[PDB]
Design a protein around this nucleic acid. Structure first.
Ligand SMILES: Nc1nc2c(ncn2[C@H]2C[C@H](O)[C@@H](CO[P@@](=O)([SeH])OP(=O)(O)OP(=O)(O)O)O2)c(=O)[nH]1
Ligand SMILES: Nc1nc2c(ncn2[C@H]2C[C@H](O)[C@@H](CO[P@@](=O)([SeH])OP(=O)(O)OP(=O)(O)O)O2)c(=O)[nH]1
Ligand SMILES: [Mn+2]
Ligand SMILES: [Mn+2]
Ligand SMILES: [Mn+2]
Ligand SMILES: [Mn+2]
Lengths: 170, 176
DNA sequence: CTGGATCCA
DNA sequence: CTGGATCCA
């Protein structure tokens, strides 16, 4: 376990130091998610989402992730979930990395921000409008629903739900 | 697990044909041997097998929640590695030796598709499926599908399925 | 080629 | 609710 402040600190050390095979990952594209983003006093792990600017790269980003400076082991890894165990200040913490292509970023932030309870209510509701929501996009009947949106707040509003901040979602 | 000869596998099966059963809210229910079908390397009559693969035909959709989850082999000592409604992998003690026993299930209307799938070998299944992929079809242990939709075929048996799909019917021992 | 059990996210 | 990684069938 870690405190919110520990998580926040850890993130910052990482914001500069992410990269992949030798290509750096802009901090602009790293987004803290999960219990950290919701600003819980206590966290179990740090959950980071990474925005990939093009579809080809997913085969390479998490599979060839590079944290310049840090000691760590990889539990499991694929193109969309890589779970790392980092040695931080003589202690071991879990670091979960996820990816989203550019056009997915809001859908993903919304999904990975959580909490789960909130996601279930939201998702349950959308089934009866024939819609399907997830981390990738919004879909009607096995088809992508193109929304003229950039951010999470815009996604949440456009979907037709009340925009609440992460700390006040459950 | 450990290796067995075709004859060992065949023998094992027979001991099992009469001894399979299941609980279903506390009624202890036997599984007809008529509904047990040897599959995998045994059915292909390879000289040597790695495990015995048995397919079980379930006559009613409700029962799947109960059959493999509450499987009963009357007489045998065994441990369960993993188990769900469709794959249950068992390790049986047979004659002071441990062998793997993989149980699968198919509903009635699935039986040919399942037999075909589980009969294998894998290499053969890939060629076959690749070809059907190119006509915009999808083959499964469950059925045949075009564009996420079931393709109803006038068929009963595996040979009829294989033929109807539009492939040359070869017997299990000569598939690869 | 295609999917199942497990155990996560 | 909805889907991912792994190790299998
Ligand atoms: N749809 C869906 N999404 C899920 C689920 N579990 C986690 N997630 C997402 C939402 C979470 O904010 C995010 C991180 O998951 P996690 O297991 Se790490 O829980 P989290 O909310 O961060 O709290 P903490 O890590 O336990 O402190 O992943 C889930 O079961 N269903
Ligand atoms: N489509 C598809 N089917 C597969 C696959 N692996 C096993 N199967 C099916 C076909 C096999 O006949 C059956 C059992 O597989 P298994 O790994 Se246990 O080997 P099997 O072919 O029985 O011979 P043996 O067990 O090695 O002696 O399950 C697969 O990857 N794709
Ligand atoms: Mn977390
Ligand atoms: Mn996590
Ligand atoms: Mn086998
Ligand atoms: Mn097997």
């Amino acid at each position: 376990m870690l405190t919110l402040i520990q998580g926040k600190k850890i993130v910052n050390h990482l914001r500069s130091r992410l990269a992949f095979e030798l290509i750096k990952i802009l901090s602009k594209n790293i987004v803290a998610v999960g219990s950290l983003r919701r600003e819980e006093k206590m966290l179990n792990d740090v959950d980071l989402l990474i925005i990939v600017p093009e579809k080809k790269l997913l085969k390479h980003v998490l599979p060839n992730i590079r944290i310049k400076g840090l000691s760590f082991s990889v539990k499991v890894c694929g193109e969309r979930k890589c779970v790392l165990f980092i040695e931080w200040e003589k202690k071991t913490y879990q670091l979960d990395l996820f990816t989203a292509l550019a056009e997915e970023k809001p859908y993903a932030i919304f999904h990975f921000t959580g909490p789960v309870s909130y996601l279930i209510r939201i998702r349950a509701a959308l089934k009866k409008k024939n819609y399907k929501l997830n981390q990738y996009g919004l879909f009607k009947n096995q088809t992508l629903v193109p929304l003229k949106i950039t951010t999470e707040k815009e996604l949440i509003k456009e979907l037709g739900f009340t925009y609440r901040i992460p700390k006040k979602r459950l």
